[PDB]
Design a protein around this ligand. Structure first.
Ligand SMILES: C[C@@H]1OCC2(CCN(c3nc4n[nH]c(-c5ccnc(NC6CC6)c5Cl)c4c(=O)n3C)CC2)[C@@H]1N
Length: 483
């Protein structure tokens, strides 16, 4: 993911591609004119083309292109299918997990002493730099990094173009001390894990000139490790089963549909993934896209087979004149058959922020297969961005949690929006985090980007924007404050 430059301007991007690039050279950057948006800058026939990428929280929408779950997936697609030939690599270490910009020597040592373990390392500014590594069962070693004529070195040997290149080299080739100590750079220092009681202090330091952005962009740089196979969703027979062509379930976590019509060559596919905390069917989730008219039967087959008793719908059926999800439930008191599944809508209960629908699901032909499915439909989420206060979402997640908990042997909770990655990802992450505080008390350890990285290894692009990332912190804070 080196083609992503987090701090360059449109002008710097232009001069970078014209002087250091060639025809086919490209890079991507956060937009300066529109904060929260992105630009893909491509060099074609001696000139630079700037392509807008918009993300309001549901997906990356390339102007004159397609819709994608991540920026790395967008790039992989155009590099394997305006030509994107050569990534123009970024040397700026700001989004590295190990880089701590302006951190003092005293602060670095206490961080490695209180939070470190064998192989824990960080890099701080001294225009020189310091590499600090902890070794043992223990001691901290400091390695000076000289910057001489735009190149970096540890006072001998190779001279690197960037700090990333130097760190990568000494990770594969560890430095050995005179008396035999191997300075192993096993993992970056974990500085994101906080005690749940200390959330207000972290939210305060992240809100200062913001820190939320640096933490979120360091998380985004790591998405290139999550380019897992999505082959089943690419099969010809499964193409019209996807709301967005390029937003596909990972094959290793996808919901596999069994007992399908024997006359149907392919009846095992749904654009849905199992999401397991720390990767029990109960405390599990199914993140899925909003139903298409041709996937409504597959959706009820999925709900039935998984023994799900609770559905969370986080979108209105229609938003900004566009279909986000088709009505997959009957009108109040009506009974509908969706293929071999039968659904009765028993009652509809309206609250301020959401609607609750009591649905009775069963298989046609078998009376004793009947179970109540509780559908919680959040209706107040803004068309763009996140709510200004997390109170509404928290009361909703509390209700959903109590329903799931009261049901013996309940299957995973089904969570869906439009693409089933943005709002869906945000609801699932908040709910994982809150469940840790429920089970272990306010005196517990939480790590927001670790939790998101784990959920993202099970479905592409879970939690889409920095606004959602910030919302997760604000929701966890509010839960703890009212505790
Ligand atoms: C300029 C800024 O200075 C400080 C700075 C660096 C330190 N830091 C931070 N941010 C993270 N965002 N995402 C992750 C992340 C990504 C992938 N996997 C995991 N965990 C899984 C168990 C492996 C995590 Cl935790 C982060 C991480 O590890 N760290 C330490 C805060 C921001 C910025 N360079």
């Amino acid at each position: 993911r080196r083609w992503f430059h987090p701090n360059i301007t449109g002008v710097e991007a232009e001069n970078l591609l014209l002087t250091r690039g060639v025809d086919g050279s490209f890079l991507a950057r956060p937009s300066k004119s529109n904060p929260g948006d992105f630009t893909l800058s491509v060099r074609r026939n001696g000139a630079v083309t700037h392509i807008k990428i918009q993300n309001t929280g549901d997906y990356y929408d390339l102007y004159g292109g397609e819709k994608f779950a991540t920026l790395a997936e967008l790039v992989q697609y155009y590099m394997e299918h305006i030509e994107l030939k050569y990534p123009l690599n970024c040397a700026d270490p700001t989004s590295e997990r190990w880089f701590h910009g302006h951190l003092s020597g005293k602060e670095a040592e206490k961080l490695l002493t209180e939070k470190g373990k064998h192989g824990s390392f960080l890099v701080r500014e001294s225009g020189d730099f310091v590499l600090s590594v902890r070794t043992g069962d223990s001691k901290v070693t400091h390695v000076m990094i000289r910057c001489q004529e735009l190149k970096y070195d540890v006072g001998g040997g190779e001279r690197f173009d960037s700090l990333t290149d130097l760190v990568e080299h000494y990770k594969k080739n560890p430095m050995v001390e005179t008396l035999g100590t191997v300075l192993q750079l096993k993992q970056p220092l974990n500085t994101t894990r906080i005690n749940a009681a200390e959330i207000e202090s972290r939210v305060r330091e992240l809100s200062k000139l913001q820190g939320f952005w640096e933490e979120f962009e360091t998380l985004q740089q790591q998405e290139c490790k999550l380019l897992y196979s999505r082959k089943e969703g690419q099969r010809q027979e499964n193409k019209n089963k996807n709301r967005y062509k390029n937003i596909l379930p990972f094959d290793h976590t996808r919901v596999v549909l069994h007992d399908g019509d024997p006359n149907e060559p392919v009846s095992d596919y749904i654009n849905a993934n199992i999401i397991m905390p720390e990767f029990k069917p109960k405390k599990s989730y199914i993140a899925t896209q909003g139903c298409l008219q041709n996937t409504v039967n597959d959706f009820w087959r999925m709900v039935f087979q998984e023994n799900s008793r609770v559905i969370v719908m986080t979108t209105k059926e229609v938003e900004r004149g566009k279909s986000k999800c088709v009505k997959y439930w009957p009108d109040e008191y009506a009974l509908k058959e969706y293929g071999v599944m039968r659904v009765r809508n028993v009652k509809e209960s309206a609250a301020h922020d959401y609607t609750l629908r009591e649905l009775k699901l069963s298989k046609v032909g078998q009376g004793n297969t009947e179970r109540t499915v509780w559908q919680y439909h959040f209706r107040t989420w803004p068309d763009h961005g996140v709510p200004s206060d997390p109170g509404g979402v928290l009361d909703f997640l509390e209700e959903v949690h109590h329903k799931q908990e009261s049901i013996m042997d309940a299957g995973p909770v089904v969570v869906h929006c439009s693409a089933g990655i943005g709002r869906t990802g945000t609801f699932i992450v908040i709910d994982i985090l809150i469940d840790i505080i429920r089970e272990k008390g306010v005196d517990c350890d939480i790590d927001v980007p670790k939790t998101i990285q784990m959920v993202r290894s099970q479905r592409s692009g879970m939690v889409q924007t920095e606004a959602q990332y910030r919302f997760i912190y604000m929701a966890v804070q509010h839960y703890i404050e009212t505790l």
